[PDB]
Structure 1
Amino acid sequence: DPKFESKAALLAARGPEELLCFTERLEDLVCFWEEAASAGVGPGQYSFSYQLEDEPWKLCRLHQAPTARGAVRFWCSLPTADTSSFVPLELRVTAASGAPRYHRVIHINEVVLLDAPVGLVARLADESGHVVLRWLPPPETPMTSHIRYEVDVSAGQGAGSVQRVEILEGRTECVLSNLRGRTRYTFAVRARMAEPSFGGFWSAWSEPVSLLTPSD
């Protein structure tokens, strides 16, 4: 629930004037936009309609919520799990007067915003001086074998981010070398669909973990 507001705000930054649609676990779909508040405008004053394949045009109830920047966010949530991925989905947003607001054609799951990976654990490798990282995929997310990851390695002082490691598709671990001894490192990992037709966006970083390397 709070995560959606962060994800919605993240997308709105890249396209403030657009109808933006994304999925989090490929089973649901949220389409939203943001506009200035007005004295009479509410969810009823807009009509959200969509057509999928040869289905009849359907209406989706619109919800209204505020944003930190003061814009009003209108959004619709459509189920998509039983829908085949990448099939065309036509979307229209029409004002009550019949005037146009939005008209788009999207493909199911073409903008995936995953949750962060979980269960990150750092471990001193049996090979001294190396660290093994292991983690779990974003929870309750299908197609885990098609998710790729990126690992961040950070030092304590001003050094900050010292390394970025790309994890090949479907892999949930990696071994880290070139680490300085007697040093407290901090690790985190993010996820994205590898196709990259699913959008190509990184998830938020996982909860971090830290570890003190051995001497020499």
Structure 2
Amino acid sequence: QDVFLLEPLNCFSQTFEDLTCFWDQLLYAYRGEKPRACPLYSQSVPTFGTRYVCQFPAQDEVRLFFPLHLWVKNVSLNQTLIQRVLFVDSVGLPAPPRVIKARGGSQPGELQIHWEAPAPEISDFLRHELRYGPTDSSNATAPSVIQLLSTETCCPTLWMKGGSCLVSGLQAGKSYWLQLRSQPDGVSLRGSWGPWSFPVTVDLPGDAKMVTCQWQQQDRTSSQGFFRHSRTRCCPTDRDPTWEKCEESRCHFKSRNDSVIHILVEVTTAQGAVHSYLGSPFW
């Protein structure tokens, strides 16, 4: 989506540290004080109107949980113009998550989305959501499926601020482009859903007392993988996945008793591409 297209007056805060009000000067006041003019620039565009936009200096002026009164004072006759009373608390339009670097770890349909939140100081308040669609897009922008990022035990905003999640339900196969957007929860901070992220073309690794994994490779291909001994301590992981060389269809490795196995079979052709067969974990 677009940062400006998200109402006589429109305002939006992407980090609750900066605010930007626009329509189509822009005098604003915090409770009781002498009004000041927000620095305004004219973004003239033939398609739309004049599109007057100003950005607050983001210095001790985006104070939260305070009523802000906006009145437009045009230089024509200083008459009454567009007005809006807003809570910078309650008009948040948070920036989308960045550095998504999502990988299809854990379950074969599972997609780990460990992201570095662009705003690290408010990552607790924001309630993110994602939209993921197939690269083919057989129905244009019809697949707007959205999974809310609640604070479950497997999708929290863990540190190294950033966060992580374990959104599931994504079918195995074609690489999925996904954009996350952030909106304040509403319990303390309120606002509209943030602009969508840049569509990142992440992929998932398709589909397929010692245990032998009897797998066969196709013609003119390779055979390699890793095995993560995460010991199911926590659902999410850090940015760097664990790497463990599959040293011998006859791969042999030592694993903890009654522990989960994060198996992976990776096939790369002569040209060089990602083509993997992932198997479900076993206890």
TM-score normalized by the length of structure 2? 0.57
Which ranges of 4 or more aligned residues in structure 1 deviate by more than 6 Å?
none
User: What displacement does 1:80 show?
Assistant: 5.0
- Of 82, 100, 113, 1:102 maps to 82
Q: Whole-Å Cα distance in 2 between the matches of residues 129 and 187 of structure 1?
A: 15
> Does the Cα contact within 8 Å between 1:111 and 1:198 map onto a contact in 2?
yes
**Aligned Cα RMSD in Å?**
3.0
> Does the Cα contact within 8 Å between 1:188 and 1:209 map onto a contact in 2?
no
Rg bigger for which structure? 2
Cα distance change of structure 1 residues 99 and 191 upon mapping to structure 2, 3 Å threshold: same
- Matched with 2:17 is 27
> Does the Cα contact within 8 Å between 2:3 and 2:194 map onto a contact in 1?
no
Report the secondary structure of 2:103's partner residue: strand
Q: Which amino acid aligns with 1:166?
A: L
Cα distance change of structure 1 residues 81 and 112 upon mapping to structure 2, 3 Å threshold: farther
Unaligned residue ranges in structure 2 (runs of 5+): 158-162, 209-283
My pick for the range that moved more, 79-88 or 105-114, is 79-88
The structure that is helix-richer by fraction is 1
Q: Which amino acid aligns with 1:131?
A: L
Q: Whole-Å Cα distance in 1 between the matches of residues 108 and 26 of structure 2?
A: 59
User: What displacement does 1:85 show?
Assistant: 0.9
1:161 equivalenced with 2:136 (yes/no): no
The structure that is strand-richer by fraction is 1
Q: Whole-Å Cα distance in 2 between the matches of residues 130 and 59 of structure 1?
A: 50
- Of 155, 175, 180, 1:189 maps to 180
- Matched with 2:30 is 52
User: What displacement does 1:109 show?
Assistant: 3.8
Cα distance change of structure 1 residues 19 and 82 upon mapping to structure 2, 3 Å threshold: same
Q: Which amino acid aligns with 2:186?
A: E
User: What displacement does 1:72 show?
Assistant: 0.6
Cα distance change of structure 1 residues 71 and 208 upon mapping to structure 2, 3 Å threshold: same
Unaligned residue ranges in structure 1 (runs of 5+): 35-46
Q: Whole-Å Cα distance in 2 between the matches of residues 126 and 56 of structure 1?
A: 57
- % identical equivalent positions: 22
Q: Whole-Å Cα distance in 2 between the matches of residues 102 and 128 of structure 1?
A: 53
1:209 equivalenced with 2:209 (yes/no): no
1:200 equivalenced with 2:192 (yes/no): yes
Q: Whole-Å Cα distance in 1 between the matches of residues 113 and 125 of structure 2?
A: 19
Q: Whole-Å Cα distance in 2 between the matches of residues 26 and 98 of structure 1?
A: 30
Q: Whole-Å Cα distance in 2 between the matches of residues 180 and 61 of structure 1?
A: 48
> Does the Cα contact within 8 Å between 2:172 and 2:207 map onto a contact in 1?
yes
